[PDB]
Amino acid sequence: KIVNIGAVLSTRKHEQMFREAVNQANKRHGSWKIQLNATSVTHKPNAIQMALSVCEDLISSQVYAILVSHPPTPNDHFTPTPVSYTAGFYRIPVLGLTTRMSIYSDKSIHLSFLRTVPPYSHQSSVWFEMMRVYNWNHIILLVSDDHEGRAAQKRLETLLEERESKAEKVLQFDPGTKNVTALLMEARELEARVIILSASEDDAATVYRAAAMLNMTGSGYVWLVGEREISGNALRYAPDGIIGLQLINGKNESAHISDAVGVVAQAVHELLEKENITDPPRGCVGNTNIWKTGPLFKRVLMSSKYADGVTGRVEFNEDGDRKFANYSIMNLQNRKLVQVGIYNGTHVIPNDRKIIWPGGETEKPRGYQMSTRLKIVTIHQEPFVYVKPTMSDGTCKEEFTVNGDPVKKVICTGPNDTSPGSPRHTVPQCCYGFCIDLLIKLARTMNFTYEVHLVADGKFGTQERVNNSNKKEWNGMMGELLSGQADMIVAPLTINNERAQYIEFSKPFKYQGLTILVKKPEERITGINDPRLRNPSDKFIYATVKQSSVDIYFRRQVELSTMYRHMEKHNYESAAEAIQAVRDNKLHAFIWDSAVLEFEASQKCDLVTTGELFFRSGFGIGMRKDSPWKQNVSLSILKSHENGFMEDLDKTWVRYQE
Amino acid sequence: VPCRKFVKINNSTNEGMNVKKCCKGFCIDILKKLSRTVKFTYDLYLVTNGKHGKKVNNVWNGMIGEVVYQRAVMAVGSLTINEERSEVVDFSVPFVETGISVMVS
């Protein structure tokens, strides 16, 4: 008829308040014969023999609730772990009260640990509530702590699953270093300015000093950290105007202990209304049997419903944390902490105090600086990308067309040849053609400059397993775009299902089908329906570009896998190699798009296309994810579609014949 | 597949009847294969306002008036695409290559 409560507490005043709350816990519960005894222990400068003394004293005491209430620990590890582990050896709930580490969030590791505080990742949820107020969609994550970094990124992806958006850049590395400045300069080149930081005080002061040396406290920069990053020398290195968080009654020890005693007491008086009430035996000497109502009492703690307390309502969720906590939002006004907001269970209310920013105005900084210099990557398309070496040094020969129009070239940068032939010989030459003048029209339309460069290979890009770690990766223009080295694939890119799963698309500019290049008895093929090409031989040589999207499109078509096993013996790197081989009568057929071969038939009259016109598809501009260059650019493309500018581009190259 | 059509009796009253009719063709097969793949539930009916869409003093008509004013969800049937229609709603990717032409003898 007795219940023991164990605690690790040092100060005699909080021990007296703890014993007074234990004595007053049986006040309003009538004249029932239950008794509540309390046992508190102090601290030894070590941690192993502390764990030993506490664990065997609470085994000999047979307590039901174990409390740790020491925020000023001299060790910066903040680990009450071994007492909770020894209680989890017999499945006894330990109620942690001070630390907020996410490693305690794992119920698989911490089988019988509960706490009345949330981890810091929920603060990012509050920062997700910052995404619901100021209409922000691109963040920059920086976490040094690898113990909580995976859980923080998992919670971040869970929060961004509702919007189905992704973070722009995430970083995890070893704490204690000082060169993170190159990563900060790479973050400077990004569009967003949202700085999310999750580390200790040393790494926070290091990145504050690194941002102060780079002078990242200008206009548009978003600064948003927590309570751990505004203490110690990080408070000395703190730039003004920074927006931080504050835990309401997180440091207030006495009311937290009183609320914990109320929660434990009402949980015990709820558990006394049930049967199958087992007791943990003397497990120190000759008793390794587990406490049989471990998960039962844990489920009793799962259904803990409350309506009274000092601060607010307390309830344990599927993770065992405190919900609906009130937070404070502080601002650093000239190295002075000024409160600028309050936070309810789910809602933010800024007060009448102004929001002073480190940059310019007091309104929200529109920190999405879009790319005004687009790194344009392209592949060498023969009717679209005409590449010519310069005359003397970086100049373009302004040749005139037959319509009185000078050719508007561009200084592109490209290699000589492929990697076995020419490994690294990249020069700036002059590029012009269809998509070059299309990009010139886009630059005339919108507010941007650009940077035209080429791709290192002659391939679009296919998904293939890299030989280490058994992972499928990309290459080509998709491999260079997703690496961040490029900005916009301006190329006749093959639109299919697999590419749209990873990036976003625009409206297609080119619309054409598929055909067969032959040379001119039926010398023609009449498309795919030739029965001699269904079961091929060494006579009719049909082939395609190596690592092309037509190969993937025919790889999905499992009913013509024999053509998949036939073109693999004759895969060519570029289409110009196929033109050179079919002019010298080494090839016999070539699956390729319609209008390119029609232009080559206008070049050379012996080139003949086939009769069947299948897979009438469209080619557009390769794009990034959700970006401010999506809606404006698609409206500009549609404006180019509605007028006769497509006919003008036909008059440049397509409609003209030779 | 069945559908309804709100056919009015006269011009004297606005009261009509929802006559149920059958439909087949291209877009019917497209919608049936979408129901095979996605495995959802659809609510198919016909519009009685008129043609595709035309704004008369910030008032659209037809399928544009049904979709933009949110009396429906999506337009599966045939619809031309221009600038302001792409401004008011979000079209999908194009699947069929249908332009304009001139019929002569």
PDB file of C-alpha atoms in Angstrom, chain A residues 102-298:
ATOM      1  CA  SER A 102      16.676  13.629 -29.656  1.00  0.00           C
ATOM      2  CA  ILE A 103      18.570  10.423 -28.797  1.00  0.00           C
ATOM      3  CA  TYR A 104      16.073   9.992 -25.942  1.00  0.00           C
ATOM      4  CA  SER A 105      13.288  10.180 -28.546  1.00  0.00           C
ATOM      5  CA  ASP A 106      14.064   6.627 -29.716  1.00  0.00           C
ATOM      6  CA  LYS A 107      11.693   4.323 -27.844  1.00  0.00           C
ATOM      7  CA  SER A 108      13.560   1.327 -29.279  1.00  0.00           C
ATOM      8  CA  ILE A 109      16.729   2.334 -27.423  1.00  0.00           C
ATOM      9  CA  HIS A 110      15.025   4.080 -24.486  1.00  0.00           C
ATOM     10  CA  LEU A 111      12.359   1.465 -23.783  1.00  0.00           C
ATOM     11  CA  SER A 112      11.054   3.040 -20.554  1.00  0.00           C
ATOM     12  CA  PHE A 113      12.023   6.713 -20.737  1.00  0.00           C
ATOM     13  CA  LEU A 114       9.481   9.532 -20.786  1.00  0.00           C
ATOM     14  CA  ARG A 115       9.933  13.284 -20.594  1.00  0.00           C
ATOM     15  CA  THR A 116       7.838  16.426 -20.246  1.00  0.00           C
ATOM     16  CA  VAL A 117       9.947  18.464 -22.707  1.00  0.00           C
ATOM     17  CA  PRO A 118      10.092  18.272 -26.526  1.00  0.00           C
ATOM     18  CA  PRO A 119      13.327  17.989 -28.521  1.00  0.00           C
ATOM     19  CA  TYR A 120      14.708  20.945 -30.443  1.00  0.00           C
ATOM     20  CA  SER A 121      13.428  19.652 -33.811  1.00  0.00           C
ATOM     21  CA  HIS A 122       9.933  20.822 -32.823  1.00  0.00           C
ATOM     22  CA  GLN A 123      11.502  24.298 -32.742  1.00  0.00           C
ATOM     23  CA  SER A 124      12.087  23.755 -36.463  1.00  0.00           C
ATOM     24  CA  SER A 125       8.366  22.932 -36.550  1.00  0.00           C
ATOM     25  CA  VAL A 126       7.903  26.426 -35.113  1.00  0.00           C
ATOM     26  CA  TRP A 127      10.245  27.507 -37.892  1.00  0.00           C
ATOM     27  CA  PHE A 128       7.922  25.568 -40.187  1.00  0.00           C
ATOM     28  CA  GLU A 129       5.285  27.851 -38.675  1.00  0.00           C
ATOM     29  CA  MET A 130       7.607  30.637 -39.817  1.00  0.00           C
ATOM     30  CA  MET A 131       7.091  29.203 -43.306  1.00  0.00           C
ATOM     31  CA  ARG A 132       3.310  29.562 -42.874  1.00  0.00           C
ATOM     32  CA  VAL A 133       3.441  33.287 -42.023  1.00  0.00           C
ATOM     33  CA  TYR A 134       6.006  34.995 -44.250  1.00  0.00           C
ATOM     34  CA  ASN A 135       5.430  32.701 -47.298  1.00  0.00           C
ATOM     35  CA  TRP A 136       8.888  31.134 -47.568  1.00  0.00           C
ATOM     36  CA  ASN A 137       9.586  27.985 -49.580  1.00  0.00           C
ATOM     37  CA  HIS A 138      13.387  27.524 -49.658  1.00  0.00           C
ATOM     38  CA  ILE A 139      15.546  26.928 -46.579  1.00  0.00           C
ATOM     39  CA  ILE A 140      19.235  26.321 -45.862  1.00  0.00           C
ATOM     40  CA  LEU A 141      19.933  23.653 -43.227  1.00  0.00           C
ATOM     41  CA  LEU A 142      23.186  23.390 -41.262  1.00  0.00           C
ATOM     42  CA  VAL A 143      23.527  20.716 -38.564  1.00  0.00           C
ATOM     43  CA  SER A 144      26.814  19.757 -36.921  1.00  0.00           C
ATOM     44  CA  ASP A 145      25.418  17.364 -34.288  1.00  0.00           C
ATOM     45  CA  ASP A 146      25.265  13.951 -35.960  1.00  0.00           C
ATOM     46  CA  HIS A 147      23.444  12.429 -32.970  1.00  0.00           C
ATOM     47  CA  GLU A 148      20.317  14.475 -33.732  1.00  0.00           C
ATOM     48  CA  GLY A 149      21.007  15.478 -37.343  1.00  0.00           C
ATOM     49  CA  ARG A 150      19.322  12.480 -38.966  1.00  0.00           C
ATOM     50  CA  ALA A 151      16.264  12.900 -36.732  1.00  0.00           C
ATOM     51  CA  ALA A 152      16.142  16.634 -37.497  1.00  0.00           C
ATOM     52  CA  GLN A 153      16.372  16.001 -41.248  1.00  0.00           C
ATOM     53  CA  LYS A 154      13.697  13.293 -40.931  1.00  0.00           C
ATOM     54  CA  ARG A 155      11.363  15.669 -39.070  1.00  0.00           C
ATOM     55  CA  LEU A 156      12.128  18.350 -41.673  1.00  0.00           C
ATOM     56  CA  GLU A 157      11.227  16.007 -44.542  1.00  0.00           C
ATOM     57  CA  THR A 158       8.070  14.979 -42.655  1.00  0.00           C
ATOM     58  CA  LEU A 159       7.072  18.648 -42.348  1.00  0.00           C
ATOM     59  CA  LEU A 160       7.932  19.391 -45.991  1.00  0.00           C
ATOM     60  CA  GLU A 161       5.946  16.341 -47.161  1.00  0.00           C
ATOM     61  CA  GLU A 162       2.753  18.398 -46.722  1.00  0.00           C
ATOM     62  CA  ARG A 163       3.952  21.018 -49.223  1.00  0.00           C
ATOM     63  CA  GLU A 164       5.921  18.345 -51.188  1.00  0.00           C
ATOM     64  CA  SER A 165       8.916  20.694 -51.338  1.00  0.00           C
ATOM     65  CA  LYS A 166      12.590  20.034 -50.647  1.00  0.00           C
ATOM     66  CA  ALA A 167      15.378  21.922 -48.917  1.00  0.00           C
ATOM     67  CA  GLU A 168      17.937  23.627 -51.128  1.00  0.00           C
ATOM     68  CA  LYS A 169      21.061  22.487 -49.258  1.00  0.00           C
ATOM     69  CA  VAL A 170      21.638  20.302 -46.193  1.00  0.00           C
ATOM     70  CA  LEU A 171      24.971  19.827 -44.424  1.00  0.00           C
ATOM     71  CA  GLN A 172      26.234  17.358 -41.817  1.00  0.00           C
ATOM     72  CA  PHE A 173      29.866  17.236 -40.699  1.00  0.00           C
ATOM     73  CA  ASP A 174      32.205  16.791 -37.733  1.00  0.00           C
ATOM     74  CA  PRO A 175      31.909  19.340 -34.891  1.00  0.00           C
ATOM     75  CA  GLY A 176      35.033  21.132 -33.710  1.00  0.00           C
ATOM     76  CA  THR A 177      36.333  22.346 -37.075  1.00  0.00           C
ATOM     77  CA  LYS A 178      36.724  25.931 -38.291  1.00  0.00           C
ATOM     78  CA  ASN A 179      36.736  25.834 -42.123  1.00  0.00           C
ATOM     79  CA  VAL A 180      33.049  25.885 -42.967  1.00  0.00           C
ATOM     80  CA  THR A 181      33.621  29.151 -44.829  1.00  0.00           C
ATOM     81  CA  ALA A 182      33.690  27.560 -48.293  1.00  0.00           C
ATOM     82  CA  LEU A 183      30.309  25.998 -47.523  1.00  0.00           C
ATOM     83  CA  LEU A 184      29.063  29.439 -46.473  1.00  0.00           C
ATOM     84  CA  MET A 185      30.298  30.896 -49.770  1.00  0.00           C
ATOM     85  CA  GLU A 186      28.489  28.100 -51.616  1.00  0.00           C
ATOM     86  CA  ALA A 187      25.407  29.028 -49.583  1.00  0.00           C
ATOM     87  CA  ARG A 188      25.977  32.641 -50.678  1.00  0.00           C
ATOM     88  CA  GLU A 189      25.632  31.535 -54.314  1.00  0.00           C
ATOM     89  CA  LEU A 190      22.266  29.914 -53.525  1.00  0.00           C
ATOM     90  CA  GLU A 191      18.983  31.742 -54.058  1.00  0.00           C
ATOM     91  CA  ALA A 192      17.589  31.476 -50.526  1.00  0.00           C
ATOM     92  CA  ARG A 193      18.961  33.181 -47.416  1.00  0.00           C
ATOM     93  CA  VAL A 194      17.190  31.108 -44.731  1.00  0.00           C
ATOM     94  CA  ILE A 195      19.837  30.028 -42.214  1.00  0.00           C
ATOM     95  CA  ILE A 196      18.774  27.133 -39.977  1.00  0.00           C
ATOM     96  CA  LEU A 197      21.450  26.092 -37.479  1.00  0.00           C
ATOM     97  CA  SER A 198      21.541  23.101 -35.117  1.00  0.00           C
ATOM     98  CA  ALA A 199      24.829  22.715 -33.228  1.00  0.00           C
ATOM     99  CA  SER A 200      26.501  23.377 -29.878  1.00  0.00           C
ATOM    100  CA  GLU A 201      27.884  26.714 -28.658  1.00  0.00           C
ATOM    101  CA  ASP A 202      31.378  26.255 -30.124  1.00  0.00           C
ATOM    102  CA  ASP A 203      30.223  25.562 -33.691  1.00  0.00           C
ATOM    103  CA  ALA A 204      27.657  28.370 -33.412  1.00  0.00           C
ATOM    104  CA  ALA A 205      30.345  30.857 -32.359  1.00  0.00           C
ATOM    105  CA  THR A 206      32.580  29.502 -35.142  1.00  0.00           C
ATOM    106  CA  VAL A 207      29.950  30.058 -37.835  1.00  0.00           C
ATOM    107  CA  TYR A 208      29.078  33.473 -36.341  1.00  0.00           C
ATOM    108  CA  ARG A 209      32.734  34.507 -36.610  1.00  0.00           C
ATOM    109  CA  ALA A 210      32.919  33.018 -40.116  1.00  0.00           C
ATOM    110  CA  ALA A 211      29.836  34.968 -41.211  1.00  0.00           C
ATOM    111  CA  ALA A 212      31.237  38.113 -39.575  1.00  0.00           C
ATOM    112  CA  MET A 213      34.507  37.747 -41.487  1.00  0.00           C
ATOM    113  CA  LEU A 214      32.539  37.226 -44.718  1.00  0.00           C
ATOM    114  CA  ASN A 215      30.119  40.044 -43.689  1.00  0.00           C
ATOM    115  CA  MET A 216      26.911  38.048 -44.190  1.00  0.00           C
ATOM    116  CA  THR A 217      24.851  40.478 -42.083  1.00  0.00           C
ATOM    117  CA  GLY A 218      23.625  42.585 -45.005  1.00  0.00           C
ATOM    118  CA  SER A 219      20.153  43.013 -46.441  1.00  0.00           C
ATOM    119  CA  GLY A 220      18.008  40.008 -47.299  1.00  0.00           C
ATOM    120  CA  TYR A 221      19.840  37.550 -45.035  1.00  0.00           C
ATOM    121  CA  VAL A 222      17.574  35.488 -42.780  1.00  0.00           C
ATOM    122  CA  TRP A 223      18.951  34.778 -39.294  1.00  0.00           C
ATOM    123  CA  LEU A 224      17.005  32.332 -37.130  1.00  0.00           C
ATOM    124  CA  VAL A 225      18.608  30.274 -34.333  1.00  0.00           C
ATOM    125  CA  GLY A 226      17.634  28.831 -30.963  1.00  0.00           C
ATOM    126  CA  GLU A 227      18.486  29.181 -27.291  1.00  0.00           C
ATOM    127  CA  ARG A 228      21.618  26.999 -27.434  1.00  0.00           C
ATOM    128  CA  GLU A 229      23.196  29.240 -30.089  1.00  0.00           C
ATOM    129  CA  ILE A 230      22.825  32.494 -28.111  1.00  0.00           C
ATOM    130  CA  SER A 231      24.845  31.489 -25.041  1.00  0.00           C
ATOM    131  CA  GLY A 232      28.507  31.705 -24.092  1.00  0.00           C
ATOM    132  CA  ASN A 233      30.894  33.164 -26.658  1.00  0.00           C
ATOM    133  CA  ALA A 234      28.178  32.717 -29.299  1.00  0.00           C
ATOM    134  CA  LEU A 235      26.276  35.446 -27.449  1.00  0.00           C
ATOM    135  CA  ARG A 236      29.414  37.596 -27.685  1.00  0.00           C
ATOM    136  CA  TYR A 237      29.724  36.762 -31.400  1.00  0.00           C
ATOM    137  CA  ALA A 238      25.988  37.246 -31.995  1.00  0.00           C
ATOM    138  CA  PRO A 239      25.059  39.745 -34.731  1.00  0.00           C
ATOM    139  CA  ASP A 240      22.276  42.139 -33.824  1.00  0.00           C
ATOM    140  CA  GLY A 241      18.772  41.824 -35.221  1.00  0.00           C
ATOM    141  CA  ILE A 242      18.863  38.026 -34.953  1.00  0.00           C
ATOM    142  CA  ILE A 243      15.602  36.206 -34.198  1.00  0.00           C
ATOM    143  CA  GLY A 244      15.896  33.612 -31.436  1.00  0.00           C
ATOM    144  CA  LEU A 245      13.637  31.383 -29.362  1.00  0.00           C
ATOM    145  CA  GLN A 246      12.992  31.133 -25.627  1.00  0.00           C
ATOM    146  CA  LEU A 247      11.489  28.276 -23.619  1.00  0.00           C
ATOM    147  CA  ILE A 248       8.798  29.607 -21.284  1.00  0.00           C
ATOM    148  CA  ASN A 249       9.437  28.092 -17.811  1.00  0.00           C
ATOM    149  CA  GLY A 250      12.065  25.760 -19.244  1.00  0.00           C
ATOM    150  CA  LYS A 251      14.609  26.954 -16.696  1.00  0.00           C
ATOM    151  CA  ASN A 252      12.036  27.381 -13.893  1.00  0.00           C
ATOM    152  CA  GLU A 253      12.860  24.331 -11.820  1.00  0.00           C
ATOM    153  CA  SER A 254      10.373  24.465  -8.931  1.00  0.00           C
ATOM    154  CA  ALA A 255       7.149  24.673 -10.952  1.00  0.00           C
ATOM    155  CA  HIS A 256       8.500  22.002 -13.316  1.00  0.00           C
ATOM    156  CA  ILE A 257       9.130  19.673 -10.353  1.00  0.00           C
ATOM    157  CA  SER A 258       5.661  20.449  -8.945  1.00  0.00           C
ATOM    158  CA  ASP A 259       3.989  19.719 -12.294  1.00  0.00           C
ATOM    159  CA  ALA A 260       5.999  16.488 -12.566  1.00  0.00           C
ATOM    160  CA  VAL A 261       4.844  15.434  -9.084  1.00  0.00           C
ATOM    161  CA  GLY A 262       1.251  16.211 -10.080  1.00  0.00           C
ATOM    162  CA  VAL A 263       1.560  14.162 -13.287  1.00  0.00           C
ATOM    163  CA  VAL A 264       3.141  11.195 -11.464  1.00  0.00           C
ATOM    164  CA  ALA A 265       0.606  11.361  -8.613  1.00  0.00           C
ATOM    165  CA  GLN A 266      -2.447  11.467 -10.881  1.00  0.00           C
ATOM    166  CA  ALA A 267      -0.946   8.668 -13.002  1.00  0.00           C
ATOM    167  CA  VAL A 268      -0.479   6.536  -9.864  1.00  0.00           C
ATOM    168  CA  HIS A 269      -4.028   7.267  -8.669  1.00  0.00           C
ATOM    169  CA  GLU A 270      -5.262   6.322 -12.151  1.00  0.00           C
ATOM    170  CA  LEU A 271      -3.231   3.090 -12.073  1.00  0.00           C
ATOM    171  CA  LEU A 272      -4.620   2.159  -8.639  1.00  0.00           C
ATOM    172  CA  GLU A 273      -8.070   1.711 -10.236  1.00  0.00           C
ATOM    173  CA  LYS A 274      -6.857  -1.442 -12.044  1.00  0.00           C
ATOM    174  CA  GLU A 275      -5.949  -5.052 -11.240  1.00  0.00           C
ATOM    175  CA  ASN A 276      -2.778  -7.043 -12.169  1.00  0.00           C
ATOM    176  CA  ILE A 277      -0.660  -4.686 -10.080  1.00  0.00           C
ATOM    177  CA  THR A 278       2.824  -6.203 -10.083  1.00  0.00           C
ATOM    178  CA  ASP A 279       5.867  -4.943  -8.200  1.00  0.00           C
ATOM    179  CA  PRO A 280       9.533  -4.850  -9.253  1.00  0.00           C
ATOM    180  CA  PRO A 281      11.378  -7.247  -6.919  1.00  0.00           C
ATOM    181  CA  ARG A 282      14.837  -6.992  -5.354  1.00  0.00           C
ATOM    182  CA  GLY A 283      16.636  -7.176  -8.697  1.00  0.00           C
ATOM    183  CA  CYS A 284      20.143  -6.591  -7.349  1.00  0.00           C
ATOM    184  CA  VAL A 285      20.733 -10.071  -5.857  1.00  0.00           C
ATOM    185  CA  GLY A 286      19.550 -13.122  -7.785  1.00  0.00           C
ATOM    186  CA  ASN A 287      16.592 -11.569  -9.627  1.00  0.00           C
ATOM    187  CA  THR A 288      16.843 -11.026 -13.389  1.00  0.00           C
ATOM    188  CA  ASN A 289      13.147 -11.576 -14.137  1.00  0.00           C
ATOM    189  CA  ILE A 290      11.511  -8.613 -15.842  1.00  0.00           C
ATOM    190  CA  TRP A 291       8.605  -6.612 -14.443  1.00  0.00           C
ATOM    191  CA  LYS A 292       5.608  -8.116 -16.206  1.00  0.00           C
ATOM    192  CA  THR A 293       3.409  -4.985 -16.371  1.00  0.00           C
ATOM    193  CA  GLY A 294       6.108  -2.850 -18.000  1.00  0.00           C
ATOM    194  CA  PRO A 295       4.330  -2.097 -21.292  1.00  0.00           C
ATOM    195  CA  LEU A 296       0.992  -2.099 -19.424  1.00  0.00           C
ATOM    196  CA  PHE A 297       2.102   0.724 -17.116  1.00  0.00           C
ATOM    197  CA  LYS A 298       3.736   2.361 -20.143  1.00  0.00           C
TER     198      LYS A 298
END
